[PDB]
Amino acid sequence: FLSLDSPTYVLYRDRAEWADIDPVPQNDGPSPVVQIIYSEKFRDVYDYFRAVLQRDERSERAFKLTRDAIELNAANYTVWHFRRVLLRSLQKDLQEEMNYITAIIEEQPKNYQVWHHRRVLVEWLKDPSQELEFIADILNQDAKNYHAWQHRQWVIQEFRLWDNELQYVDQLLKEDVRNNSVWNQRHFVISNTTGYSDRAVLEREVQYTLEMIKLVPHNESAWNYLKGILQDRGLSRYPNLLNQLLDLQPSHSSPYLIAFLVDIYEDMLENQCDNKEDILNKALELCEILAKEKDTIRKEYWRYIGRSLQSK
Amino acid sequence: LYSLRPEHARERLQDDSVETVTSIEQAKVEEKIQEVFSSYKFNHLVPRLVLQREKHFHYLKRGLRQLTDAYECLDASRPWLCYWILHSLELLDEPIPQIVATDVCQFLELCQSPDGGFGGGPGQYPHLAPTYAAVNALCIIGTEEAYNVINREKLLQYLYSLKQPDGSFLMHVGGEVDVRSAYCAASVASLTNIITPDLFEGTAEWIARCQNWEGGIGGVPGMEAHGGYTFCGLAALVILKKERSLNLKSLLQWVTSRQMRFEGGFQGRCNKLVDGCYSFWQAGLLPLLHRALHAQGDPALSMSHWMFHQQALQEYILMCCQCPAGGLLDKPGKSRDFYHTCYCLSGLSIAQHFGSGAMLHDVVMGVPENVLQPTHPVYNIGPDKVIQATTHFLQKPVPGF
Ligand SMILES: Cn1cncc1CN(Cc1cccc(C#N)c1)c1ccc(C#N)c(-c2cccc3ccccc23)c1
Ligand SMILES: CC(C)CCCC(C)CCCC(C)C[C@@H](O)P(=O)(O)O
Ligand SMILES: [Zn+2]
């Protein structure tokens, strides 16, 4: 009704329609701590919120007030709550509200209440029709907004909207193959639709992954993915693995190739294999290289793997 | 210094020539960091890593009393500011005047809800975050008074009020759900000794479902592995004594991969940037993982170090996350705040102190005055405060009903 930002915006204390109420001030105790020095504005709006809340005045004017209170500190979950009460009580047009929250999110895509608030609305309306488009927009401004992705996964699961997400994933991966969120999303999707048991799928997936690897050999995501879909069933069940991997030694090498090999070797040992002795040696040598030369930042770990590799 | 060395310059980013928004940003930080590293060579001084303890102390000392309107954005996390500050000091081995502590006690009391738990400030609905903070705070103080502020009987009620059938908890009535809640609950419940037999029924299983293909743990099952959530998970499991509910192996490989080979610090998510705070959220997992593994009799475990470059991390923090005026920070360029102050320091300490039964190989970078007081890898408060608290509440009966 009156923008927090209008040059013509104003103190509630100062308002004609807000004179029947006495502004309840914050009570931080006689001897404050971590006490914030609020702007006359911030204090104004909240002193009044304290009151309306305290009275539990479920009025239109209160409603409009939480808006101001939220803009002042969108992280204030209490206000976010009372607002939801007003929404139900005053019986407010929710789609209208959807738009509101939509704009707020655009503004603080990293706030926790805003996203939850939206999920509540969607729930209330049982209408996911706008979600995937909205989210995409936000992920369009920050392809890695944890909340957005989280929100998206909820909409997809709850309303079973799996059909075009892989396509989406492929789109984003084309934009930044290093986007771990997408790789994850990719796993989320396939594992909830077809699963990785499907030979064809499995093969498709690795093939693809082996590509991205053999394309950006120092991109760790691809590696963790390939390892991810594989390692749940045993790398060692995968013969050519070692080989093709072995081929990339001079052509697409990184500590990742080595770590992976060390990983294969591990499984090839868990399952027992001829030449194991040698295998163990080859493995231990890699451990040292990674530890001593190739990836020393985690030398503690790499040597620990060398020691474990000793007992088991 | 490990970082100032010439071969360390090979740990620089391999763009593969395929530049994406990610490469770009990473590369960006790397340069900003390089600069800080080469700070010494250009100026011709011997590098001397020092923790601006006094400057930090004056910063903290001040904030514990009042903050600028720049802090309005936190008006709902006051107990947190308490904790952060009250811990940093704690780590800095600084004093907590018997009067200031009281005020804190008194303030938190005002934050405490009649329904149990704590709110972000006086009159706010209870929330697990502030609750976790409040408690830790009170503990850090550790006095009959502080402890007596906590209404155990009500705490339980509250805790139960948020408990979900699938084992998770809400952060607050009508609130969201994610691992944070689990850790929050577990931490406060255990410390105060209010854990009933069914309180955390199935919680361990819920947390376990959060561990994904990355080996890491996410906010809720299905989500990307994340440092902040991973700590909550693990820590939570350690408290319930069920770490084994996870695949610790892959967990280990994930966290360890989170340390930046060139920067020395940690990243919250694969292919994300370094961030001081993760000095704790990520690095703290190792001490937790040590116990765990050692717990299932792991022989290959070190008796002197954590499974991460303690050196590098100390360097990063010391060289890159310290604010001249006082306070620590995300990374160079980023502003200072008590959150990062609280966690950079927490990370430092983690990096400076090792243990493993009776072993004690501390590693203090630069000026020995840089060493900090020790902190508990689960609660993130002085191990002595932890012990002190649990035992005090131990002599109280779990609120059975
Ligand atoms: C951008 N960035 C890079 N590194 C961190 C950030 C963001 N930032 C710092 C933050 C936010 C608000 C105030 C302070 C302070 N002091 C610090 C964040 C981001 C996410 C979370 C989460 N979850 C938190 C957070 C964690 C634990 C307790 C909290 C209590 C109150 C508020 C936030 C808290 C802080
Ligand atoms: C007990 C606790 C409140 C623990 C909180 C631990 C955390 C730092 C959690 C981080 C929350 C999230 C989702 C952060 C992400 O936005 P980002 O990775 O961008 O920092
Ligand atoms: Zn941070």
With beta carbons less than 8 A apart as the criterion, state whether B139 and B146 touch.
yes
Closest ligand (CA of B339): 1
CA–CA distance, A295 with B7 (Å, rounded to integer): 12
- Does the C-beta of B216 come closer than 6 Å to ligand 2? no
A91 three-class SS: coil
Q: Is B226 a catalytic residue?
A: yes
- Contact in structure between A219 and B26 (CB atoms under 8 Å): no
How many CB atoms lie under 10 A from the CB of residue A196? Answer: 18
Q: Consult the annotation and say whether B87 binds a ligand.
A: no
Tell me, in Å, the resolution of the deposited structure: 2.7
CA B132 to ligand 2: nearest atom: 1
> How crowded is residue B47: how many other Cβ atoms within 10 Å of its Cβ?
15
A299 touches chain B (CB under 8 A): yes
Q: How many domains, in total, are found in chain A?
A: 1
- Report which of B309, B313, B312, B318 is spatially closest to residue B369, judged by C-alpha positions: B318
Taking the C-alpha atoms of residue B117 and residue B248, their distance in angstroms, rounded to an integer, is 32
Cα distances (angstroms) measured from residue A143 to each of B54, B219, B257: 41, 18, 22
Q: Where are the beta strands (DSSP E) in B159-235?
A: none
d(CA B103, nearest CA chain A) in Å: 6
- Domain map (residue ranges) of chain B: 1-401
Task: Indicate whether residue B233 lines ligand 2 (CB < 6 A).
Answer: no
Q: Which of B323, B278, B260 is nearest to A296 (CA)?
A: B260
B180 lines ligand 2 (CB under 6 A): yes
Q: How far B175 CA sits from the closest chain A CA (Å)? A: 8
Contact status, residue B229 vs residue B176, Cβ threshold 8 Å: no
CA atoms of B350 and B345, how far apart (whole Å): 8
- Which range marks the domain in which residue A25 is found? 1-312
H helices of chain A, in order, are 40-55, 60-72, 77-89, 94-107, 112-125, 131-141, 146-158, 165-175, 180-193, 199-213, 220-230, 239-251, 255-270, 276-289, 299-311
Tokens of B350: 């983690």
- Domain covering B1-401 in this structure, CATH number: 1.50.10.20
Q: Give residue B110's identity as a one-letter amino acid code.
A: L
Q: Is B178 in the pocket of ligand 1 (CB under 6 A)?
A: no
- Starting from the CA of residue B265, give the closest ligand: 3
Please answer whether residues A304 and B301 qualify as being in contact, where contact means their C-beta atoms are separated by less than 8 angstroms.
Answer: yes
> By three-state DSSP, how is residue A197 classified?
coil
Cα separations in angstroms, B317 against A126, B43, B55, B267, B280 = 48, 21, 16, 13, 11
Method: X-ray
Report the residue from B16, B124, B300 with minimal CB separation from A310: B300
Q: How many CA atoms lie within 13 A of A72 on its CB side?
A: 23
Q: Is B356 on the interface with A (CB under 8 A)?
A: no
Nearest CA to ligand 1 atom 34: B339
Strand partners of residue B328:
B322
Distance from CA of B81 to the nearest CA of A (A): 7
List residues bridging with B217 in a β-sheet.
Answer: B211
DSSP string, B44-101: T--------HHHHHHHHHHHTTEE-GGGGGGTT-HHHHHHHHHHHHHHTT----TTHH
C-alpha distances (whole Å) from A232 to each of A237, A279, B248 are: 10, 21, 15
How far is ligand 2, taken at its centre, from the CA of residue B94, in Å?
A: 27
